[PDB]
Design a protein around this nucleic acid. Sequence first.
DNA 1: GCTATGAGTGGCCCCTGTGGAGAGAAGCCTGTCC
DNA 2: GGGGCCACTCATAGC
RNA 3: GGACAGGCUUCUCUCCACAGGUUUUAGAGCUAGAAAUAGCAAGUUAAAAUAAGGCUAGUCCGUUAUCAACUUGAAAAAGUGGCACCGAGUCGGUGCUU
Length: 1176
Amino acid sequence: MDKKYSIGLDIGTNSVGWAVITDEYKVPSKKFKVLGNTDRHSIKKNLIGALLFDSGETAEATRLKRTARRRYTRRKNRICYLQEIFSNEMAKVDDSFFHRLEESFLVEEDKKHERHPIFGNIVDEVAYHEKYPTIYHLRKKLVDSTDKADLRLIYLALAHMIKFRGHFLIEGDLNPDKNLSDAILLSDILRVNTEITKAPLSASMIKRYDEHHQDLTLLKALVRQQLPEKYKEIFFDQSKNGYAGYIDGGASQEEFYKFIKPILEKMDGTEELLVKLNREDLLRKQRTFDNGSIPHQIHLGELHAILRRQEDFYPFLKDNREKIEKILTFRIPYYVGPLARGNSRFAWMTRKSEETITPWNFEEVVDKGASAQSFIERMTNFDKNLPNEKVLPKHSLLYEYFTVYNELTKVKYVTEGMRKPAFLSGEQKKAIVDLLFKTNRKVTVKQLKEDYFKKIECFDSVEISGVEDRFNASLGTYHDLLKIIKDKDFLDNEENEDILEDIVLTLTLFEDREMIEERLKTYAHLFDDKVMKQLKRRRYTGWGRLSRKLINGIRDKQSGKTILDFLKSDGFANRNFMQLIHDDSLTFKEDIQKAQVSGQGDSLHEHIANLAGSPAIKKGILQTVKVVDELVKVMGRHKPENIVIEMARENQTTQKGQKNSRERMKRIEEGIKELGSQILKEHPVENTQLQNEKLYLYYLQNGRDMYVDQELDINRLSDYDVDHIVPQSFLKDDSIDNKVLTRSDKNRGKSDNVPSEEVVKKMKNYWRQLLNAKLITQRKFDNLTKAERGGLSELDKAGFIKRQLVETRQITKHVAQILDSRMNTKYDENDKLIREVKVITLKSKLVSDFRKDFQFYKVREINNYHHAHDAYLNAVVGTALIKKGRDFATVRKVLSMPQVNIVKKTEVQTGGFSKESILPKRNSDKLIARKKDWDPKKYGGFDSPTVAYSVLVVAKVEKGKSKKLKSVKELLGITIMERSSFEKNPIDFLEAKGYKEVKKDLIIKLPKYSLFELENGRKRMLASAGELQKGNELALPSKYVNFLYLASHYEKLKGSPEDNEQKQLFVEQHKHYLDEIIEQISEFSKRVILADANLDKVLSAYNKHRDKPIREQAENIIHLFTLTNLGAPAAFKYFDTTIDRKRYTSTKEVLDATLIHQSITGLYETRIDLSQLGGD
DNA sequence: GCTATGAGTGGCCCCTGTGGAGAGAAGCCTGTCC
DNA sequence: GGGGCCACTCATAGC
RNA sequence: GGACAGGCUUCUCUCCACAGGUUUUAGAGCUAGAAAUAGCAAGUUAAAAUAAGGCUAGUCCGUUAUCAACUUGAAAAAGUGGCACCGAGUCGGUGCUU
């Protein structure tokens, strides 16, 4: 008798529940064979459990770091090119100069040439540093002076300019000598410069340096006169935030101003210093974060001026001037991609010739057009119905016609005397299109009634059905082409359809003017110069969903018509796109079926990866599938009858749906009208322009920045910045409310912090005005008020985010269809899939209601059994709905079961080698060198490697000064950086670490969260080489859970008042349960936790607060289970008492433990005794 | 009489800010079809 | 959030 | 249940760039004092690296994803574990079979 059974499943981002039930809703228990060398040959367990694993992580960090690596490599390349140019002349004056520069980072002892880099001797080096305190002084000297300087100084200037060439955010040239705004923008870049020089930036920096010196001297004198006691603190203590820290220490400028402001108020004669302090300009450094606004053209001008001045003495400079200028100016275009030779998975460049690509010959080697085409196409989707065909651009003329005709396909018109609404003829539709769609960018119902029915067809009153106040489709591309070309018959000619489609595709693909001009040069014979130039400026983005071959490429074998041909006119049928593709009277459906490529199916891994979502949900799907397969294997390979899955999606109010559906432009108009401001009056704007986030945020700001009281400029939004109210490190939120447009320097000044208190105070009134305007969300107000609320907190950083609930939805039906594919595969006599297994979807509301109605509450903070219980309830509810005392008793018995299978999936750690910060030199063996030849003692380096996994080693170690051999048995941690060498040859790596006579056969691969068992059932999981985590699970009787739930929401119960009072009475009567809960926690702790100090602290705190109100008792006790929870220990707050985490910092006890390897469900076990291995 | 050492406990530390270009998916809301 | 690290203290083992 | 059409919201992938920060070294510290130390002077810049490196030698690649254990496998992958009943503190006992 094949016992009928069903499987229930719950899927989350971190948990996967599984449950097996019979038709009587009982959970069967089976005896399972146990492998290994232990005595326990057979173990009985129940068929219920849940799997826990680490969350998946996105690739954003990897992409960012790859981009950074590429930037560093290319910058090094540019420096190498400059050195290549200079080598011939530099060798004649100083052969060792470049070696001195290259090895300058090394200590004195390891340097081969003389220690002073610039001149190799003390006198000239000192003289140079005295004459030129900053490199910008040297730059100005070279720009203005007309005398021949040393070549080495010229090299330093050129290299410094190249290595910090600045941004390319502005196109074209920005040299004032349109001129008025040019000079204004230059004054914006650099402020106040009286003398006319070709290097204004250097003059500005020198002026800043001199202001620094004068203010430093004045402050020194004032402090020494008035505050003698605090002089040493300000000028000697590097640990504080004073001037010493601002210079020698890591103190930021903001902290320096914060530390220095109160002292300035305490002294006289500090007025101007305070005024400059209000402008963030006192004692300001030169190399600062404000320089990010400097355009590269300024450095280009300075470079060109210096080269022009010195080219009269060194001919090679004059010959190579253009090369040097291009080195600064050249960059690889974004559509080109990396210049890889085929060996890179991220690259797509097509190379014309096998020469080495250089900045001087880039044009001759790289096919810009083909590269751009490949870049655009490889990310677009293929047509679903025609897999081998690319989709058309969303602005295609043919696609727009298709949309218009499809919308007009089902329009029904009712006139006087007509009994039923009527379909439009092909002639009628063509006339309507010609009369209105080619004349108006948007067509409304009123416009149609006035212009076509009443004027042309002469119908006085007409009733229109199926269209609401306007037709969705619009011929905007046609209007733009009519505006530009101004030749209507050229647009109307069908022989130009190929040419027009090619034009539209060209305009969609490319954004560089040069490429567009190059491609249109073939068609320049048909249009004048002005028309050709105008077309170069039009741009389109986006793509459609159907291919040209689908709409007007394939023809019906019987009539010769395409789908578009049918849509234009099909007689009384008036069949739409869906009807035509589902029409059995045409060959189109046969073409669809034939085009279905029965190609090599994606593997389970690949099929899961091809879904759209976070890779975490992909990992969840893969784990669920393997769980299902193993469960099927357990029951004798008999397929289950039913599978139940759960999603936690919660529906939303409709009126919110329509108010979102309203275009943002209308709601901005309403907000401005409530305000009454004239910003839209001065600058009217259209919704498709609001489609860009930049201009939309600018309008939301109403031209006024939240952070600084300053007027935004419409033409400067590109240079402007948007910064998140909450930094990305604390929490990731790209929502519009978190996004706020801000002045650039103000943004870059405020980093990794919430807005400061005083800015909030000064802009609070304006923020309330905005909130009354409703242009701002209350959530964004909450973000702006974090300083009042207390800033960032640990609790807000980690929590169950809403985004996981989004990840759960229809990706859950995706895993459902994946299971459907495998479970039902047999085809019947008619080649129809035989659905032997049903896929069931139920919403979490049903199960939550079942729980609330029948007192089966769940409290997540107690243990991990809740996932398994939810899966069991899902299965029960699904089976019941497709299909009382005995069932309810069975449910209560199941929910009270003490044995539940909880398994933590073992994972090999990967990722970064260690912490990214570099620490100063010190005498410790735990530092790792940044380079092969750089001694960590003399150079410092990285710290705290992340252990990939641990291995058990039995060998002998030469210990003591006597070098005597001693048999040892311990855990050795393999770093990720050493993983390759260890896996290449374990024996060699172990010998290198100092182990001798290693028994290779005893090596056991122990990944993270590996499980060990001890006496009395105490369990531990291997967290790393030297730290463990709690591995046991607390089983609590259900009545205590129910009592705790009731007490927790004592004043928050959601039920009938009589039921609320009954539950209150039940809570009052069973108050003695609290002591039982405490005693059970105490017993569990004394047995498996071993936290005697923490347990005594908790117990003492309990009796002290024994008289507190019951609800607070419940809130505190629920927090108390964090002591006994699975995983790493965590700190928690019990009333006002704080308990530190108890960390198990020694792993010696598990060397004599019983190692357990658990299957993906844990039903199979393999136990190995470690006491018998490596016996002394 | 001195030293090496294992063992534990308490507290602190964790690289960052952005600009531009494109593509895609998924939730809702309206209308039409299978 | 959580593993790593260092200063500090003590208790014991061996000589 | 699915697809196209219009509006809004949220997130994912790829590329091109900028500004920093950190680290070592160079920028003769002076005076009195054996030294401990005290006083004074100065403080802004610079070079190089920015995951160890790898061979496929590119102006490329190196932090995503995958993985219980045993056998066959380079890997992917394939195979490897009785049942029924009475019970229940992390699972026990009871009866048949290999």
